[PDB]
Design brief:
The structure is cut from a larger assembly and holds chains A and B. By secondary structure, chain A is an all-alpha fold. Helix content of chain A is 85%, strand content 0%. The chains are: A mainly alpha, B mainly alpha. It is classed as hydrolase.
Amino acid sequence: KLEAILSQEVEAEIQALLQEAEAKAEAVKREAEEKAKALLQARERALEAQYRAALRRAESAG
Amino acid sequence: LEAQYRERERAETEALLARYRERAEAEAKAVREKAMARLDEAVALVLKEVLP
């Protein structure tokens, strides 16, 4: 039959789509974690700068 | 995070100065107390070089 052909045609597209769309929902979850990570790394860098500078200022004053 | 780090630093840039003041004044006294004993000797050296 012609109908036994057709059911294999949907079940084929509808797995490719759902693997593509779990390869976007994975990729985003990665890039966002590495984003979140880097936005606290940069937060680390700032704190040092502002404390190293500050201690020198208060020393020179005294 | 920055919020709890700015006030931290403020309280340390008060602690640091507070100790500097205590040394400074005690070492100001140490330049007074050192002189006032070796005081007649200075006046002697001065006098001795004005009156020729």
